[PDB]
Amino acid sequence: REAAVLQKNYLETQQAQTQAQLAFLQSKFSNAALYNWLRGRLSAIYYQF
Amino acid sequence: DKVMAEIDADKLALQESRHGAQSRFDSFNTLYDEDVNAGEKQAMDLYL
Numbered sequence: 001r002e003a004a005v006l007q008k009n010y011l012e013t014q015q016a017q018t019q020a021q022l023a024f025l026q027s028k029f030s031n032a033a034l035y036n037w038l039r040g041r042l043s044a045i046y047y048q049f
Numbered sequence: 050d051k052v053m054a055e056i057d058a059d060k061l062a063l064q065e066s067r068h069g070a071q072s073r074f075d076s077f078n079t080l081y082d083e084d085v086n087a088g089e090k091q092a093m094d095l096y097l
Contacts, residue, residue, distance in 0.1 A: 002051055003051040003052065003055065006051060
């Protein structure tokens with residue numbers, strides 16, 4: 001039983017680590033929103049050029 | 050660490066199985082060592 005409680009603590013640690021990776025990818029400067037803006041702006045510039 | 054502790058407690062369970070098997074073996078061994086009792090041989094003497 002105590003081994004299973006440690007396993008649940010391990011899984012909750014993995015949940016918090018997955019959320020930490022997710023928050024890093026949301027909050028990084030080179031996230032998907034920068035590339036959305038970047039290709040939309042460059043697409044407009046590219047058609048006019 | 051808890052896996053190893055589970056192995057230890059399982060060892061204690063098997064040792065307490067062994068103690069009961071040993072008690073049965075000693076008890077049936079001392080029953081087998083005496084063929085008949087003192088009173089049983091006395092009763093044989095009385096029937097004869």
